Amino acid sequence: VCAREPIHIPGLIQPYGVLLVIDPADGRIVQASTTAADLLGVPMAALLGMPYTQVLTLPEAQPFAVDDQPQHLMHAEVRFPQRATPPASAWVAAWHLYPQQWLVEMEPRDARLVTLREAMPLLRSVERDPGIAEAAVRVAKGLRSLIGFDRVMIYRFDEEWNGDIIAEARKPELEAYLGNHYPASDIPAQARALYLRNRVRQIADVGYQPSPIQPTVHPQLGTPVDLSDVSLRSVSPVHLEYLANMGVTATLVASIVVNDALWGLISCHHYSPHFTNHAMRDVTDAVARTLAGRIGALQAVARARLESVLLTVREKLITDFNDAEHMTVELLDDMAPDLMDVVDADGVAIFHGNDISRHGTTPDVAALRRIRDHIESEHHEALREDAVGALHVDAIGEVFPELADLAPLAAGFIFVPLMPQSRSALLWTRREQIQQIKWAGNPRKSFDLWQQTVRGRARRWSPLHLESARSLRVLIELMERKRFQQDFTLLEASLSRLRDGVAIIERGTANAAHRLLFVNTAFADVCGSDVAELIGRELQTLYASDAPRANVELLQDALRNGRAAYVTLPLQVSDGAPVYRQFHLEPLPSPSGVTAHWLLQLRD
Amino acid sequence: VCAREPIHIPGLIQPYGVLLVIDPADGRIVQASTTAADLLGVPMAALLGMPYTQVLTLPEAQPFAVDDQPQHLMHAEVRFPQRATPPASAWVAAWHLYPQQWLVEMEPRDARVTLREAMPLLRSVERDPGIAEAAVRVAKGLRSLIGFDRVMIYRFDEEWNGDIIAEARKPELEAYLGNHYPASDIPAQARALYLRNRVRQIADVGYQPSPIQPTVHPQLGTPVDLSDVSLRSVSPVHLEYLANMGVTATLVASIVVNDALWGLISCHHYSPHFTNHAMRDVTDAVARTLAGRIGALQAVARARLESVLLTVREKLITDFNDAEHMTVELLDDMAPDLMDVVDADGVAIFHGNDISRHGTTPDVAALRRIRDHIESEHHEALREDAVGALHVDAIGEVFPELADLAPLAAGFIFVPLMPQSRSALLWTRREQIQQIKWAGNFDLWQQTVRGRARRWSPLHLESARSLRVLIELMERKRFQQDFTLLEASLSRLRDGVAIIERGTANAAHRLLFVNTAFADVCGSDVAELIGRELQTSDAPRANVELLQDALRNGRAAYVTLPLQVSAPVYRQFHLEPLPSPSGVTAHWLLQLR
Ligand SMILES: */C=C/C1=C(C)C(=O)N/C1=C\C1=NC(=C\c2[nH]c(/C=C3\NC(=O)C(C=C)=C3C)c(C)c2CCC(=O)O)/C(CCC(=O)O)=C1C
């Protein structure tokens, strides 16, 4: 209900200044705020439709036509040629030039307090600063000394769009808000979007009298005035209520936009009214921009540093695994430190059909089995599909309520393979980590901080670490390939040391012939020519080309139709001696039941 | 080797300003530039050894002792009392405070609404998309701001050579946009310094270099390291080059992105021009905002890409693990994405003597020629030094023998890195011709480069390393296929065979596998007999001893022995040791017909 409000078209202005909407056609004022008549001279009635040029007193810079991209002119000096000695305070005006309309927003110079040159030492220091933490506080303190504001804080948005005050500088008399968590709903998405547009936004006095724009909708277009870039835009009464509720009288926020995303906000509070002149808003913009800059650089650098150390450790594991042929206890005991490190796990369990190799801080062997079963279950087959490369939980008691316990050691885990593939598996665990969420209340009466203690949840699985996990998926197929390769060579060796003389035949196609896949030494000896020089040979090669049509037909039939045949046939005898053997051909069971291979035993 | 020159210790200053080296212990001047005596009242002789307090007075800020980290003070007002009416103009000075020495560098204020006036440009680059659009906005923006005859954005490529991506000039002149320059033009020596001193400036090419009178410190014996001094005399090598291109004044701001040098803001004035501190701090600001934007957009788009690759990587992994039969349609439906995951033009899947060519890839015989050359003994050096996969950006350089093929396989990604064979994957990127606009390697020269593909993205290379699993996946699935084949083969035999696992004297000699023909002679079925000890007296001690003794050493035995049948039944027990990698018998084959 709240996330749906205009806020960019309230048709109201903060009374401290004046707004005018001018038709870029020739120069006539089409819309103006009720405050315009008081300071401009000509009252409301005749001021509307009047050329801006009648009140043309822009000494520094003038507006101009715009093609497509709206150009925004800075705050420069402005006068009034209607009244003799117009106000008491000095006035400055900024332009918002659009292809459809123009907008001029004026406010007092304020003067009083090179203030941009004076900002440079603070900027120059945050630039050099390591860690976001150190920067945040330097800005909080620095800006608190630079600008007046009784309370200045750094509000950081978390993943779920909730906020946390990471830094704060305030008058020792005020009760510190450092460490406070606020819901996402406190700053709705509609709001957040504007903070990427207008980056520095100040409220001079909470509970001001909103000066409305006289022709609410454009008299010639029929559309309301989209402020969005106007600094004198009237903020939502929802926020104003909330502000008044917390006893604040003045505001100034600066958007911490990092990688085109609103990372955080600089939030300033004055418990007495305060207007920050165009000069200071450009200073806070500067310090916001430098902070956004540094926080994003530090993010970038350290993300890259981590990615590399993980890769070097990932490779170390992959190689040492491919090297050793037998998975011993010491291999896995020397593997485990790093196998844990690569994902920042507290424990790791390696499974290999009925066996488990538990390492670090992991639940008991029986408990790990209870987990694996629950994961590989039919009911939980939904999770495995929706999961990316690996299955992972941040709180076990939520995804698998049956495994509500175990959470003290396995609150979070990473399971791979994602398929119910079995034999080889890997379980990375992260033990429970209790969290105190220092709230601000649970429109509301606020103040009172409620400290929500959260059990059964581990540390959030880093996306960096999750792709680092998905990367080691290879250790599973590696284990498996190495196992099948072990039993295969065993059986290939077994087969080759036989006396009966056997060959395996791969069924061909309509353009491919029936070839030999495997042949033992006992078979290759009856054919004279060695084993390696018979593999990949057509079956017609093997028997002589002087054989009876009746006998070969019987065999060819069994090959053509995938049937079995027992036929005595002469062999392709290079020497001469007539050698005849009983050709036992037997179809081997296929999953489709459609013959793919045959076994050929030779004994007459 | 050009970079061998010092450049940070020339012992010379740009004449426009004055330098002084003060003993932070004494408060006295130890070294000073020949220009110091002319500005300051006291001539060189008595100015050397004189306490700094006397000759100059600092109203805004004063120097101080430093523990370890050198502290630098900004440009603030300075007055010289040791002379009656000495201000040729207005003078401003900056400090460089070190634990061993102090350095003060002064220059005129110059004057002529700037830092506030810079803000609209910054705030605009701050939000425009693409590095291209930013580069030009800065080029144009900074030209209007400082007012140099030409402002150009120089981007360093992978091999440290530079290319002008954007340029703003006077309507007249010759455009340098698109021009490529060598790495030799800006030595590593120099580049390192532009991370140190951010904004560098030459007021007049062919100035008279004012030397520091005591060249080496009189008490330390070491020269003055001017790496942070703005009035540092630049290499005559570069000055010659500058004079050769007709430029009279320069200004070069460093585009440092994620603490690394990404580019340079190069400004040329074909008439002399001194850019005061005020402006250098403005160009620094615009350089920092550009760096900022270029690094953000890099970051955003890196993230966007990583995700689309992951979604496609997962699609491949799953569909591969699903299908059991490595069919033609399997690979034909796999290939579009198998190519996409690495942004290849072609992909070849190898499976022992066989190849599955896809996209724009060389002929089957040519692919074999490539694989052989990779798996070679001579090229075993590359495979070790390579990360997770072997990759080339120009095959003709890495594999000179494979100089051709380049039209279709100019670049490739080969996995597995080991001479593992059977399963392999080769990703290809065809040749991409590049027109290189040179500086004269002093007029127009365009170099057309053949035999090189598009640079293998580091993101795509880790995306390749990620699919390493498809190889072990193919392999596991292949061994599993032949295993079941052989397990089925042996079980349909008539001779009656069993495989025996050697018990390491802790465990007995047990049966690993048994066929139906063997399990029938023993009556009881196959699945019950697996895992049972060979111990199955009803037999002569002489005959069993022969069998036991063979098993004992790991030797073979052919002995006729009775059995346990529900008629006694005797069979010739042919035990044969199976080859082990260690050569130490681990299994035996037992056939009995
Ligand atoms: C309807 C939901 C809302 C609840 C509940 C609420 O308290 N406010 C709600 C709506 C809006 N908030 C808007 C802006 C806004 N809210 C905050 C929140 C904080 N500011 C603080 O200083 C602190 C603590 C010190 C908190 C928790 C901020 C910072 C802002 C924007 C700041 C600014 O630019 O002045 C908002 C939009 C109003 C607007 O148009 O600016 C709405 C609708």
Ligand SMILES: */C=C/C1=C(C)C(=O)N/C1=C\C1=NC(=C\c2[nH]c(/C=C3\NC(=O)C(C=C)=C3C)c(C)c2CCC(=O)O)/C(CCC(=O)O)=C1C
């Ligand atoms: C010894 C090899 C050199 C050749 C050949 C050459 O032409 N110069 C060589 C050496 C040095 N160059 C140094 C600085 C420097 N070089 C360039 C080159 C360019 N300037 C331009 O405007 C363009 C194109 C439009 C090019 C390619 C620049 C800009 C700079 C200054 C870097 C900066 O100020 O940030 C140099 C070091 C001198 C120094 O001490 O500053 C050497 C030795």
